Structure 1
Amino acid sequence: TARGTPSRFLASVLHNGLGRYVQQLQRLSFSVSRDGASSRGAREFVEREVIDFARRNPGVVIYVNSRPCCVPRVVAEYLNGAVREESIHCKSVEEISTLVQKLADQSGLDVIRIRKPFHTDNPSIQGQWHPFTNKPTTFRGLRPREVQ
C-alpha cells in the first residue's frame, strides 16, 4: 500500500533528456550455469541474444559469468548507483530478453509510488496565484473602514 511503502516524485537522474539522452543502465552481470535446468533459458540467451544486445547497447558492459548456480541471476547497475538484482530462474529466452530490455530502458530510480505523474521546475509562467491576485487596488492603499 502507499501508506506502507515509500514514495518519491517523478524525476530524472541528471535531466536526462535536456541536452542528450544517456542510457542510465551501465552494467549487466549474468550469473549463469553450464549445467542445471534452471539456467537453460539463460544459456540460450547467452548463446543467441546477449551479443546482439551488447552491440545494440554499447554503453552497457555485460559480464557473463558461468559458474555452478541453482538460481541464475542478472544484476543491473545504473549510473546513479542503483543495483537491481533479478532472477532469470526457469525463464525462457523471450522472457529473459524482455527483462533485459526493460532493465536497459529503465532508469536507476527506485520503483516505488510516484506522487505526481508530472514534474515541473517552472510550474508558473504568469505568476503563481496569491490572494492579492484578482484583487483591485484602492486609492492611497486605504484598507476598508480607514478614515484617512
Structure 2
Amino acid sequence: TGRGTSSRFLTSVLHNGLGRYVQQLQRLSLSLSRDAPSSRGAREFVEREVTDFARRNPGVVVYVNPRPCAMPRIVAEYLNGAVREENVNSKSVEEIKSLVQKLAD
C-alpha cells in the first residue's frame, strides 16, 4: 500500500513555529437535527462543550447550524486550504469532543 499510495516529506505550513505558533484550523461547521436520534450526542456537545471549545480556541470560527438533517456532519477548514469532513452520526458527546480537539491540533 506504500507503493499504491502517495508520500511526501515532513514539513510545516509556513515555518509554523519559528517565530510564533499559529493554529492552522480556522473554521469548524457543525450541522444538527433538532429532533433526530442520531444527532443526540452532537446536540449535547453544543449544549455543554461547544462554547468552551470556542473560548479556548479564539482563532477558529465555529458555525453551528441546526436544521432538518439525517446525519450530523463536521467540516474543518485549514489555513493551507485543506478541508476535512467527518460524519458524526450517532456518536457520544465524548467522542465528538475528542474528535473536535484532534481537528484543532
TM-score band, normalised by shorter chain: over 0.9
Following TM superposition, the consecutive aligned residue runs of length 4 or more in structure 1 with deviations greater than 3 angstroms are none
| Unpaired runs of at least 5, structure 2 | none
Larger Rg: 1
| Mapped partners of 2:12, 2:51: distance in 1 | 29
Residue 33 of structure 1: aligned partner: 33
Structure 2 residue 46 is matched with structure 1 residue 46: yes
Shift of 1:29: 0.4
| Structure that is richer in helix per residue | 2
Instruction: Tell me the equivalent position of 2:78.
Output: 78
Please state which structure has a larger fraction of its residues in strand.
2
Q: 1:12 is matched with which residue?
A: 12
Across the aligned residues of Structure 1 and Structure 2, the Cα RMSD in angstroms comes to 0.6
The residue type paired with residue 100 of structure 1 is: V
TM-score normalised by length of structure 2: 0.98
What is the CA-CA distance between 1:13 and the residue it aligns to? 0.3
Matches within 5 A, 1:1-148: 1-105=1-105
Tell me the CA shift for residue 68 of structure 1: 1.1
What percentage of residue pairs aligned between the two structures are identical? 82
Could you give the per-residue CA deviations for residues 21-80 of structure 1, whole angstroms, max 9, x where no partner exists? 100000000011101111000000000000000000000000000111111000000000
TM-score (norm 1): 0.70
For residues 70 and 7 of structure 2, the distance between their equivalents in structure 1, rounded to whole angstroms, comes to 34
Q: Which has the higher contact order (CA 8 A, sep 6+)?
A: 2
